[PDB]
Amino acid sequence: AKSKNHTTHNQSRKWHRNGIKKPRSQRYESLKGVDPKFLRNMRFAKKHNKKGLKKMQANNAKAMSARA
Amino acid sequence: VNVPKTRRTFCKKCGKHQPHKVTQYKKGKDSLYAQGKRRYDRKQSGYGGQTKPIFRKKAKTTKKIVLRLECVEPNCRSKRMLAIKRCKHFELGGDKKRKGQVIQF
Amino acid sequence: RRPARCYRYCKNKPYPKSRFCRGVPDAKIRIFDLGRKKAKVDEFPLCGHMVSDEYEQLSSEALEAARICANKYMVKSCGKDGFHIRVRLHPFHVIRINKMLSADRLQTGMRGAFGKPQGTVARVHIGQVIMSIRTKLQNKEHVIEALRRAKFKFPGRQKIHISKKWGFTKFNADEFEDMVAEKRLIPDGCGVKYIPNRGPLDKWRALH
Amino acid sequence: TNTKGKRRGTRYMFSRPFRKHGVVPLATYMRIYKKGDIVDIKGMGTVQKGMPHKCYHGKTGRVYNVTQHAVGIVVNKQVKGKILAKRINVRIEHIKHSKSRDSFLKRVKENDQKKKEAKEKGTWVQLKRQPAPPREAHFVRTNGKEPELLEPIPYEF
RNA sequence: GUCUACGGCCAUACCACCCUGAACGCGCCCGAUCUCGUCUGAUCUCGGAAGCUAAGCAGGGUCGGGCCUGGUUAGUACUUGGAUGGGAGACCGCCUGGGAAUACCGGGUGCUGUAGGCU
RNA sequence: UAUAGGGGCGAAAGACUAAUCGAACCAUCUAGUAGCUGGUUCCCUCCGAAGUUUCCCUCAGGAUAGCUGGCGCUCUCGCCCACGCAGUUUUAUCCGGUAAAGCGAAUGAUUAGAGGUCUUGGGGCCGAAACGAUCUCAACCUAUUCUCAAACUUUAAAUGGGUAAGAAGCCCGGCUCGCUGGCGUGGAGCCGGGGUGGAAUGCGAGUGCCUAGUGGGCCACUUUUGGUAAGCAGAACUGGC
RNA sequence: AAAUGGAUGGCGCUGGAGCGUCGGGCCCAUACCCGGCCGUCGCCGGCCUACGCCGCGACGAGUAGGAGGGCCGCUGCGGU
RNA sequence: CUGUUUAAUUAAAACAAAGCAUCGCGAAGGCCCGCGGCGGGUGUUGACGCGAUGUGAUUUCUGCCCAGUGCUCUGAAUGUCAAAGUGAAGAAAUUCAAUGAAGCGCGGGUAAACGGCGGGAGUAACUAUGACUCUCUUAAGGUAGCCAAAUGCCUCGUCAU
RNA sequence: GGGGAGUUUGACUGGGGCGGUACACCUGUCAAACGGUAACGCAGGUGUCCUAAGGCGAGCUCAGGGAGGACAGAAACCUCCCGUGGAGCAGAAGGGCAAAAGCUCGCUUGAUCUUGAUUUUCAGUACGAAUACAGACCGUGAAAGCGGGGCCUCACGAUCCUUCUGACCUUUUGGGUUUUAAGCAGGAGGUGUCAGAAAAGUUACCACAGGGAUAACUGGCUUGUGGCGGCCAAGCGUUCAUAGCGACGUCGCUUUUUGAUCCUUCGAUGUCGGCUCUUCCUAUCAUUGUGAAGCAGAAUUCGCCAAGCGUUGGAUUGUUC
RNA sequence: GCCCGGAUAGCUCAGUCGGUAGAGCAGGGGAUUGAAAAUCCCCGUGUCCUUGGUUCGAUUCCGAGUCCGGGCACCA
Ligand SMILES: [Mg+2]
Ligand SMILES: [Mg+2]
Ligand SMILES: [Mg+2]
Ligand SMILES: [Mg+2]
Ligand SMILES: [Mg+2]
Ligand SMILES: [Mg+2]
Ligand SMILES: [Mg+2]
Ligand SMILES: [Mg+2]
Ligand SMILES: [Mg+2]
Ligand SMILES: [Mg+2]
Ligand SMILES: [Mg+2]
Ligand SMILES: [Mg+2]
Ligand SMILES: [Mg+2]
Ligand SMILES: [Mg+2]
Ligand SMILES: [Mg+2]
Ligand SMILES: [Mg+2]
Ligand SMILES: [Mg+2]
Ligand SMILES: [Mg+2]
Ligand SMILES: [Mg+2]
Ligand SMILES: [Mg+2]
Ligand SMILES: [Mg+2]
Ligand SMILES: [Mg+2]
Ligand SMILES: [Mg+2]
Ligand SMILES: [Mg+2]
Ligand SMILES: [Mg+2]
Ligand SMILES: [Mg+2]
Ligand SMILES: [Mg+2]
Ligand SMILES: [Mg+2]
Ligand SMILES: [Mg+2]
Ligand SMILES: [Mg+2]
Ligand SMILES: [Mg+2]
Ligand SMILES: [Mg+2]
Ligand SMILES: [Mg+2]
Ligand SMILES: [Mg+2]
Ligand SMILES: [Mg+2]
Ligand SMILES: [Mg+2]
Ligand SMILES: [Mg+2]
Ligand SMILES: [Mg+2]
Ligand SMILES: [Mg+2]
Ligand SMILES: [Mg+2]
Ligand SMILES: [Mg+2]
Ligand SMILES: [Mg+2]
Ligand SMILES: [Mg+2]
Ligand SMILES: [Mg+2]
Ligand SMILES: [Mg+2]
Ligand SMILES: [Mg+2]
Ligand SMILES: [Mg+2]
Ligand SMILES: [Mg+2]
Ligand SMILES: [Mg+2]
Ligand SMILES: [Mg+2]
Ligand SMILES: [Mg+2]
Ligand SMILES: [Mg+2]
Ligand SMILES: [Mg+2]
Ligand SMILES: [Mg+2]
Ligand SMILES: [Mg+2]
Ligand SMILES: [Mg+2]
Ligand SMILES: [Mg+2]
Ligand SMILES: [Zn+2]
């Protein structure tokens, strides 16, 4: 009662049927796992961007449109 | 192994390192009128013999050692348990060694 | 003693007498030089050696029989101390025996099948010298006849060459006497010490 | 049955090679790792805290995270039927930059300068990389001497 | 053409021995009352400056040892792929491409950054 | 006439008990159970495998991945240049410690000669004896020499493995930050603006669900482990059956 | 040198029908090419059962298995 | 010995058997059956009986072990000790303690109860063999007898016929 | 309390049993220069040990050798010089380490509490181990920092149930108070068949479903072992290598010994030996024809063509022998 | 062939608790007896089988051999 124990034959020819493609990798990669201190920085950074970035950036857009 | 008697360690009640009495854990006398014990006697009564399996093949000859800790400060009195690795031989708190010693065997 | 037909062509990896074997018996050969061991360099100009043609194993008992046959023909042919013979090839590979009838079926099958150490063989590459006999210029036929009588006692096919080199050293016999006469090669027993000229000057001052 | 623990095929791979045993030189530490760099991973036996694995030796990945004294890399590792982008945390002592991306940035900057000068002066500079062309019809010289005659040599041993 | 302080590469910059060093500088050196620490002011710490380049140090040298690099080794050993190639087998030869190491021989033996100072 | 089935009877053979007995016969529970054999009924078209990973009182079996098919869906084409991809090459750039080679380079084994005079013990000789003097021996050291290594190595291939070869990229200007901090400093994010012609070759790609069968393999070149060897057992790369 | 009588396949074959080196012709597979026919697939076209009709081009092996079509078939039921 | 047995493969050396032993029991008992009752059987019986075994005529014999394993006798002798009962704490559920039937362990007997019964070293005026002597050792170390047998591997043991 | 009843009797496996654990977890190698990759392959380990052998800081440098010094000797103590790991780091090896990860000393508990992410095994599940952080509260150091066990790779364990700890926690069923019980969160009590059933034996009185996935008999490949040969020639042979033999070695053949393997048959190929009977082989015992001898004759021995024809009667043992 | 159990004065043998070499017997020495045994008073006797690791130390704890000694070697 003895059988062939382990092999890796006929494995590459199975793997390359559908193809060994890459893992997609879309834009704006997943941001979990990054440094919590940096993340606590960047969240308040974003919400205060969206808070105070109206007036002076609108001024600078008017200024750069007047220049060009 | 060998642990000391007093050992300043964090206790969660008063949020600081406080000194602790360190004693040996006792398993505690198991009690009748618990849930599993009442279920075990309810299923054990009647003509059924041994329902739940009793254990035979004990292989681990060592037991993990856990320590009872007490905050030495009055009216805090927080107890908690902490584990060490396995050991065959254990002493509580005495006989620390020296390196300038002659044996005399 | 199993027949040497099976212990032949180099199949398994080299397995030396070492830390991991620990039970191999002694090799058959123990000495390696038979002639005038203390011969100086110019006492024997030529050498004839024996080139292997095949890639195979040679057993220590075969080397033992071959050096004895060549020794006996030399001392009958050109007298004692008229030759210096050297077996350049040493046995270090250790062969294995998984012996049975240890007559019935009932001991074991092929279950525990890593054999015990049988003995020692010597691995040969193609073009490697087995024996080298350094003799006088007059002894050219005796060397050929001796290595012919050893050729039958080794297995396989291998040929016999008469070297271009002086002595056992690696220098040409034509350049040898012309170059030892003045400058470089100082004789050292049976060996020859080469000198470069990129040394400290104490060597050149100790010379001349 | 090959005793599948960490770091088993590494009698040679995590070794400091030769005449280089000792303290780590500090130019490995004093480098700047920004998010988006491309780094090589190479094992160092002297610093035993944050060695990656025996799998990721020589693999080249992307940096996405920076901490006090380590760095998090994304590395394409092949497993059985598909390749995956994993996320490793490696200390700084095992890491160096790939020079490939810096060479490509030099290519990009030369291409931008040639593009600006070409739009300036109307020249068509052909700023792509052409592969090795066949040899042009050159014109050899045999002055003074007939060509040397070669023949196969007679065998000796 | 140099040194000091901090360095980067980490022996082309080590090791052995022999020469030379003007000015600053580093030292060697003279002493323990405070700071200090020892069995011991030898080491560590502290107040200096009578001497000295003898040593470290710095430069040079050794048909120097080592290192680095380049030839020879050698298209040799090996090797991806191929053949209704040879061979009883062992292995070997060929087409296709790639291609190494020791003895042997020749050459070198620190280069630099920042701040500071002497000719 | 008595003894009736886990019962009877047996001068004991586990024999006999209606041709059945190491637990009789008949009916019912009952279409009991089975990872185990056997069979499993019309045509044509299209696509088309696996005998492998892990876990299991698992090793003739199942679950799990992988392979397959069906159902689609979301985009791309048609009217000096595209999106994306690749069992491929090139151009760069890293990585390895095998083939080979090496021992006058560490470790491990190992052959032989020569030189030297410290150290002894041992032989001989001058001698009452004396490192008093001398010859010899071994050991030792010095440069040499022959051969090696799956559990040695300075060196070190060919084949190979990863990454890159651009608009998700450059470059400019500004806002925000409780993070960092000599510094309006660093780093991220956000906004607005500016210029796509960035190796070779080939192609349509991306994505979701459901799930059958499979979980007994074998051979061939080459590399390889055990064995004397095998049409033997066991592996690797590729192909085939 | 091996047990029934037998195997370069046999018959045979020696200026070859043997060995090695080669040449010029010649034979043929479902391979290739050309041409016809069937089906699948794709790309369409027409305001002609639109579930039909033609057109173009590339391809068709196959067990375990999976789908699609069948104006294939047996027996019965409502409608015709 | 006569006898009997596996009908349908065995006829025996097996089985029984007389003889020899051994053990329980004085009827409110032994040994059994029975779902049940003082219901049956031995029993219409009473130790020259009934019940349960071992061995197997006569003749001659019945060795040595109570360590193991059984069996049995003994005493609340004293450790272990289950319900119920007692006492205590508690609002109560509950908890604790003391007391402690059989049995187990402690002690005595039994082998015609199951069963078991050693190995070394030296040693005699030719050599061998060795009565004797010393030592470890178990509870006891195979005694009377008997044999290569139906039991002896080596084995076709050695000698005689 | 086997008088009676029910049930169990691991798995791997060059057949099974016996033997072993290759049944969990580590090191080197096989491993074919990324990773992965097997056998009852090799060479080994583990079911621990540590109040320090952990953490930090400071000082110092080891093994070994040479040279010297009362008792001192091969080995006691001291001092100098050389000393790139030849030592030590708890342990099996490998890696790594020299103003150190080693030795000594001073402080000490970071071997503490808590959420996550990721690696490792991998199905991209878990336990275990580990990495990098985050927030407390600390130790150390002048400070930079280091530290959340052991310089790194092994040292360990689910559900259920018990047990202990934590909150002025929840529910304890018509509403209250208290006991008790249940619950949340995290530690231990074990599953070594180590991702975890609670488990003895025998069948020769056996039964059933199956397997040639799997032994005993033949057949086939193989030839160690058995048997039969060949080459070389140290010798033996009164002298003399080869009339006859021939060691030390060496290359083959045979399937009449035994072994290895499991390819065929487990819905059956009737298994030893003997009796009888036919045919074939030659590696020739005798006969025909020959050659050589250490062949005087005789009697022998060794070769060649040669299987035509012979190769018996008995005591024993079932025998082949 | 596996699998266990060993080795110690001249001989039987213990002691192992990693730090001790011990009993009995034999040999040797006296006394006692005319003289032998026996007795009484004493002695000496070991590489703790060999080669290696851990330890501060190996007669002992392990690793490897030597020479012994038990047990298994079954279905067919
Ligand atoms: Mg299988
Ligand atoms: Mg009850
Ligand atoms: Mg033979
Ligand atoms: Mg003072
Ligand atoms: Mg002081
Ligand atoms: Mg001073
Ligand atoms: Mg000086
Ligand atoms: Mg000077
Ligand atoms: Mg030089
Ligand atoms: Mg210099
Ligand atoms: Mg019944
Ligand atoms: Mg009947
Ligand atoms: Mg049915
Ligand atoms: Mg049925
Ligand atoms: Mg399975
Ligand atoms: Mg699909
Ligand atoms: Mg390797
Ligand atoms: Mg090699
Ligand atoms: Mg299906
Ligand atoms: Mg599936
Ligand atoms: Mg199956
Ligand atoms: Mg080839
Ligand atoms: Mg195979
Ligand atoms: Mg097979
Ligand atoms: Mg023929
Ligand atoms: Mg088809
Ligand atoms: Mg009857
Ligand atoms: Mg009959
Ligand atoms: Mg009665
Ligand atoms: Mg009688
Ligand atoms: Mg008796
Ligand atoms: Mg008693
Ligand atoms: Mg009570
Ligand atoms: Mg009494
Ligand atoms: Mg006698
Ligand atoms: Mg007797
Ligand atoms: Mg029963
Ligand atoms: Mg089994
Ligand atoms: Mg690999
Ligand atoms: Mg590889
Ligand atoms: Mg020094
Ligand atoms: Mg190490
Ligand atoms: Mg320090
Ligand atoms: Mg922290
Ligand atoms: Mg209620
Ligand atoms: Mg109520
Ligand atoms: Mg498991
Ligand atoms: Mg049974
Ligand atoms: Mg019977
Ligand atoms: Mg088969
Ligand atoms: Mg068979
Ligand atoms: Mg049949
Ligand atoms: Mg039949
Ligand atoms: Mg028949
Ligand atoms: Mg005939
Ligand atoms: Mg033993
Ligand atoms: Mg003795
Ligand atoms: Zn507290």
Side-chain angles (χ1 to χ4, degrees):
Chain A
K2 188 177 284 185
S3 64
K4 186 175 177 66
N5 296 317
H6 170 73
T7 182
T8 59
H9 180 73
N10 201 1
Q11 291 292 317
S12 178
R13 192 173 62 84
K14 283 193 287 188
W15 295 340
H16 291 90
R17 300 297 293 272
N18 293 317
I20 293 282
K21 29 192 107 131
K22 233 89 336 169
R24 210 141 92 261
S25 114
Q26 230 103 203
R27 235 277 214 44
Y28 294 163
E29 295 292 330
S30 65
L31 199 267
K32 65 187 288 185
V34 187
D35 193 5
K37 188 180 290 293
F38 180 77
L39 184 58
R40 289 171 191 268
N41 191 11
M42 189 181 74
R43 284 185 177 177
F44 299 124
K46 289 181 180 180
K47 81 173 187 178
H48 290 85
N49 283 313
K50 190 172 71 176
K51 178 178 174 67
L53 191 270
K54 193 275 302 294
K55 55 183 75 64
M56 292 180 184
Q57 189 69 43
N59 288 121
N60 211 164
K62 291 181 182 179
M64 70 179 295
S65 65
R67 290 176 64 189
Chain B
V1 294
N2 207 168
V3 302
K5 293 296 198 294
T6 63
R7 181 178 176 180
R8 180 179 288 173
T9 316
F10 183 74
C11 64
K12 291 190 288 184
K13 183 187 283 187
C14 59
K16 292 186 263 74
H17 282 169
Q18 299 298 321
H20 290 286
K21 286 171 67 175
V22 177
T23 60
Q24 180 63 41
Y25 178 75
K26 179 62 71 177
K27 186 180 182 293
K29 188 174 178 67
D30 52 356
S31 178
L32 194 63
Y33 294 101
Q35 182 179 4
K37 183 69 176 178
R38 284 174 295 165
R39 184 180 295 111
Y40 184 75
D41 285 333
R42 179 63 179 86
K43 191 173 179 178
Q44 186 64 253
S45 69
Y47 285 107
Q50 187 66 43
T51 69
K52 287 188 179 181
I54 58 172
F55 186 75
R56 301 288 183 182
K57 296 188 288 185
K58 184 174 73 69
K60 289 180 175 65
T61 63
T62 68
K63 296 183 180 180
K64 286 184 181 179
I65 300 300
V66 290
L67 299 174
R68 183 184 295 274
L69 277 74
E70 292 180 355
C71 180
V72 181
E73 294 294 325
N75 77 24
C76 184
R77 298 183 66 87
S78 179
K79 299 181 179 67
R80 71 180 180 90
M81 296 299 165
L82 191 144
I84 317 169
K85 289 185 180 180
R86 295 180 183 272
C87 65
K88 295 178 71 69
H89 182 77
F90 186 79
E91 292 181 352
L92 178 63
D95 289 331
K96 64 181 181 293
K97 86 283 290 177
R98 291 182 180 177
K99 293 182 181 180
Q101 187 64 40
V102 59
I103 304 163
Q104 288 301 111
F105 50 86
Chain C
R1 181 68 173 88
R2 299 179 73 184
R5 177 178 60 248
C6 63
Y7 293 109
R8 206 175 177 179
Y9 310 113
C10 295
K11 291 176 73 174
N12 299 121
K13 287 181 177 66
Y15 178 74
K17 175 181 181 294
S18 64
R19 185 181 177 181
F20 291 90
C21 185
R22 295 175 295 170
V24 50
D26 196 2
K28 187 68 175 177
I29 50 179
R30 290 179 181 89
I31 64 171
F32 292 94
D33 296 331
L34 296 165
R36 183 177 292 172
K37 295 169 70 70
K38 293 182 284 185
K40 294 182 184 293
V41 175
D42 290 333
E43 292 178 352
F44 293 107
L46 68 88
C47 71
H49 52 84
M50 189 175 181
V51 179
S52 297
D53 199 2
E54 293 177 352
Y55 181 80
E56 62 185 1
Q57 292 180 356
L58 299 179
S59 68
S60 65
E61 296 176 355
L63 289 169
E64 173 65 30
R67 65 99 182 268
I68 291 301
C69 182
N71 202 173
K72 184 63 66 66
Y73 183 71
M74 279 289 105
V75 300
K76 287 183 180 180
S77 300
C78 64
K80 185 182 288 185
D81 293 331
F83 68 101
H84 180 74
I85 186 167
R86 180 178 291 169
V87 179
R88 294 175 66 90
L89 180 64
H90 297 87
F92 290 106
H93 185 72
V94 173
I95 58 172
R96 293 190 294 270
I97 176 176
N98 192 2
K99 65 183 179 181
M100 298 176 186
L101 299 182
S102 297
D104 203 357
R105 293 178 184 268
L106 272 63
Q107 66 272 15
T108 307
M110 292 292 287
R111 188 183 297 274
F114 186 77
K116 293 172 69 174
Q118 171 63 39
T120 61
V121 301
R123 296 187 67 194
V124 183
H125 293 89
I126 293 171
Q128 186 174 0
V129 178
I130 297 172
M131 288 184 181
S132 292
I133 300 171
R134 53 186 294 273
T135 53
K136 298 289 194 292
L137 191 62
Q138 295 176 355
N139 291 320
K140 187 176 179 180
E141 292 86 4
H142 299 88
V143 170
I144 294 173
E145 186 68 28
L147 294 176
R148 182 182 178 180
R149 295 185 190 274
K151 177 181 169 66
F152 293 104
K153 198 171 262 79
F154 283 106
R157 183 180 63 248
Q158 67 271 5
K159 70 182 182 68
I160 169 176
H161 191 274
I162 295 169
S163 177
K164 191 172 73 70
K165 303 292 178 68
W166 186 276
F168 281 170
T169 189
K170 63 189 76 171
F171 296 97
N172 288 318
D174 182 74
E175 296 174 353
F176 187 81
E177 285 191 355
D178 199 3
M179 189 260 284
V180 298
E182 293 181 354
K183 186 72 175 178
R184 295 178 180 178
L185 300 181
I186 176 169
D188 193 7
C190 66
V192 170
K193 288 173 68 175
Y194 184 81
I195 59 168
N197 53 5
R198 58 178 192 274
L201 198 63
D202 285 332
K203 299 292 184 181
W204 187 73
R205 290 179 185 271
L207 290 173
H208 303 89
Chain D
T1 187
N2 285 321
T3 311
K4 299 183 75 170
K6 186 185 283 189
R7 199 184 63 186
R8 67 178 178 87
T10 68
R11 189 173 183 270
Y12 295 92
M13 188 178 73
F14 285 104
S15 177
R16 299 297 307 276
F18 191 69
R19 285 200 296 272
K20 286 178 183 178
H21 290 288
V23 298
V24 283
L26 299 173
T28 301
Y29 290 96
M30 290 177 283
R31 291 183 187 274
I32 314 302
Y33 290 157
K34 293 175 69 176
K35 290 184 181 179
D37 287 328
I38 291 171
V39 291
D40 287 332
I41 298 170
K42 185 176 179 179
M44 296 291 286
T46 57
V47 173
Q48 293 85 15
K49 292 290 184 183
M51 61 179 69
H53 199 262
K54 59 183 172 66
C55 292
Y56 307 108
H57 183 75
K59 270 75 176 176
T60 296
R62 180 183 178 87
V63 174
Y64 75 101
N65 191 5
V66 173
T67 182
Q68 277 81 240
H69 54 90
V71 62
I73 309 170
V74 51
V75 171
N76 291 318
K77 178 182 173 182
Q78 182 179 1
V79 298
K80 183 177 180 179
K82 60 185 179 180
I83 61 171
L84 291 174
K86 290 184 182 179
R87 293 158 68 91
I88 316 167
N89 293 319
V90 183
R91 296 179 69 95
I92 312 166
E93 293 88 357
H94 299 282
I95 306 301
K96 62 174 71 176
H97 293 96
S98 175
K99 293 179 175 66
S100 65
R101 186 66 188 270
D102 286 331
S103 67
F104 179 69
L105 263 67
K106 290 183 180 180
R107 290 178 182 175
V108 169
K109 189 173 263 76
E110 290 178 355
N111 284 316
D112 284 331
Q113 186 175 3
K114 289 179 182 180
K115 184 182 289 184
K116 191 261 187 294
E117 189 268 330
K119 189 179 290 295
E120 177 70 27
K121 288 168 66 177
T123 311
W124 186 256
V125 303
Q126 285 295 110
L127 54 92
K128 290 185 179 182
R129 289 183 291 115
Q130 292 296 109
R135 301 180 186 93
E136 296 292 329
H138 61 92
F139 200 84
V140 302
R141 181 66 61 85
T142 179
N143 52 358
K145 292 181 182 179
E146 290 293 329
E148 185 70 29
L149 186 63
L150 296 178
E151 294 301 331
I153 51 174
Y155 177 75
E156 290 180 352
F157 182 70

